[PDB]
Amino acid sequence: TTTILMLPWLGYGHLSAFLELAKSLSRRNFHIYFCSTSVNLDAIKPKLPSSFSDSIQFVELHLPSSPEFPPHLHTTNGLPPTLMPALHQAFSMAAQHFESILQTLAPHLLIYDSLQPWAPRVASSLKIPAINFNTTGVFGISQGLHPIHYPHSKFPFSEFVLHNHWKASTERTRKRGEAFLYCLHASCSVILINSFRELEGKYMDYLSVLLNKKVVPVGPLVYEPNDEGYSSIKNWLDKKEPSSTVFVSFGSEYFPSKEEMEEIAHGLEASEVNFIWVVRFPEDALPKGFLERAGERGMVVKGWAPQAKILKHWSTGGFVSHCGWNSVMESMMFGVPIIGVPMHVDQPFNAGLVEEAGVGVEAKRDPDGKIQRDEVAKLIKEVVVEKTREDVRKKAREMSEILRSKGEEKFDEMVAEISLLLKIEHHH
Numbered sequence: 264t265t266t267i268l269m270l271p272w273l274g275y276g277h278l279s280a281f282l283e284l285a286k287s288l289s290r291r292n293f294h295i296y297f298c299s300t301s302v303n304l305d306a307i308k309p310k311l312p313s314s315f316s317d318s319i320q321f322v323e324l325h326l327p328s329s330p331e332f333p334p335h336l337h338t339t340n341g342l343p344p345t346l347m348p349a350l351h352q353a354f355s356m357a358a359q360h361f362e363s364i365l366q367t368l369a370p371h372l373l374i375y376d377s378l379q380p381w382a383p384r385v386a387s388s389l390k391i392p393a394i395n396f397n398t399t400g401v402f403g404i405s406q407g408l409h410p411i412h413y414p415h416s417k418f419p420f421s422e423f424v425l426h427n428h429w430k431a432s433t434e435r436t437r438k439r440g441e442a443f444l445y446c447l448h449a450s451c452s453v454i455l456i457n458s459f460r461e462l463e464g465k466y467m468d469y470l471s472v473l474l475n476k477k478v479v480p481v482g483p484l485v486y487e488p489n490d491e492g493y494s495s496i497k498n499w500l501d502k503k504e505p506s507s508t509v510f511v512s513f514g515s516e517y518f519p520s521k522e523e524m525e526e527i528a529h530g531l532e533a534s535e536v537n538f539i540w541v542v543r544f545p546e547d548a549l550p551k552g553f554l555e556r557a558g559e560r561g562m563v564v565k566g567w568a569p570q571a572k573i574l575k576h577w578s579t580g581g582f583v584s585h586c587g588w589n590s591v592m593e594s595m596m597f598g599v600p601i602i603g604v605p606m607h608v609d610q611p612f613n614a615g616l617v618e619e620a621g622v623g624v625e626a627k628r629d630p631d632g633k634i635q636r637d638e639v640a641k642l643i644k645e646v647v648v649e650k651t652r653e654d655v656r657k658k659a660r661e662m663s664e665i666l667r668s669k670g671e672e673k674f675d676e677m678v679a680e681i682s683l684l685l686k687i688e689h690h691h
């Protein structure tokens with residue numbers, strides 16, 4: 264049996280996408296070692312059906328631990344952002360344990376994420392072929408690589424303009440970019456990416472030319488379940504009108520500021536929409552009286568919600584999203600129009616891609632980068648409450664139809680490249 268060890272970055276969204284890719288590989292009769300920190304393995308295990316456990320085995324990676332940085336914090340999930348430097352540093356210090364794991368398990372292939380340049384180096388030292396898998400889409404990566412090669416030309420295949428809020432140490436930034444690009448460039452023969460050609464084909468081809476490396480899409484990778492609070496939520500959703508409710512979430516690794524929560528809350532209130540809002544803490548940052556005024560229209564879920572089940576509910580008409588890539592792919596698979604409120608990293612690019620696909624809208628920030636309650640209210644009003652953006656709802660339905668027609672064949676290209684790479688390296 265051919266064995267693959269998979270090393271996601273320590274972010275719940277990365278674990279999620281890597282687990283869906285592991286399932287696709289298990290169905291092609293690979294044996295998978297799924298490697299992460301215990302706190303991340305615990306978080307993702309509920310998403311693995313028992314039928315996979317014979318072929319997808321979890322393997323704990325150990326980071327340096329201390330009372331001030333214990334194992335429960337060895338994840339980005341709900342991590343204070345000022346511990347993010349420590350998390351990256353501790354992950355790099357796991358390379359020795361990672362080498363021991365690779366020596367013991369001797370997988371035929373490593374699949375690694377883009378936040379760990381040390382991982383392909385350890386694999387190479389053990390003569391283990393290694394392929395990079397990106398859990399993001401292509402658009403934002405190509406937008407980041409383009410100015411390196413064409414600093415005085417506009418990106419060629421879009422009308423997207425990055426807002427100044429995101430455009431604003433330079434050396435530290437260059438080194439982070441170099442480490443990220445190294446993970447892609449170091450990949451053996453191909454880069455795998457969680458995207459699909461109907462959405463990003465021309466950006467895939469452009470990225471491939473810029474990197475001079477083959478880009479192989481393996482998306483859409485969307486988890487679908489079959490009671491983490493769902494029964495109460497379902498009963499509440501069941502009593503709403505069709506497509507009347509927005510889900511509101513900013514993902515697993517971001518806490519909006521009190522100022523940002525103020526604007527989102529007032530936007531939800533003015534829109535008069537039904538809403539389910541996931542609020543997380545690393546105190547109450549909602550405006551005084553907001554929930555009491557919302558009454559039965561509003562529901563705040565503390566900590567974590569069953570996002571997929573909510574998005575699939577007939578009562579859900581829109582998704583106010585930070586536009587993390589898994590949330591975007593889920594919303595497209597499920598046919599739910601996105602009202603984009605991106606926060607940082609790849610999110611502003613994901614929102615512009617959503618807007619340019621016509622399957623959602625982006626709430627624009629003010630010149631100084633502040634969220635606008637009037638823009639949130641307007642877009643929820645148009646897309647969900649009044650549904651005067653029929654064009655967006657139609658495009659979102661059409662995208663869901665395309666994504667639902669995809670099957671196992673979306674993994675054919677990856678499987679062929681794995682087969683070739685292993686047949687070549689066995690000779691070497």
Ligand SMILES: C[C@H](CO)OC[C@@H](C)OC[C@@H](C)OC[C@@H](C)OC[C@@H](C)OC[C@H](C)OC[C@@H](C)O
Binds near residue numbers: 438440441
């Ligand atoms: C995250 C995003 C990217 O997706 O931002 C990354 C960015 C911040 O990284 C900047 C860094 C990669 O600068 C590279 C630069 C040195 O390359 C210049 C290029 C034109 O070749 C020059 C010359 C022939 O080659 C010199 C080189 C080969 O050593």
Ligand SMILES: O=c1ccn([C@@H]2O[C@H](COP(=O)(O)OP(=O)(O)O)[C@@H](O)[C@H]2O)c(=O)[nH]1
Binds near residue numbers: 517568
């Ligand atoms: O309350 C929540 C919040 C998020 N998610 C899931 O967590 C992942 C978030 O990944 P994404 O790429 O959207 O952004 P990130 O959280 O990593 O910034 C997605 O699969 C969501 O469905 C969830 O199940 N419940």
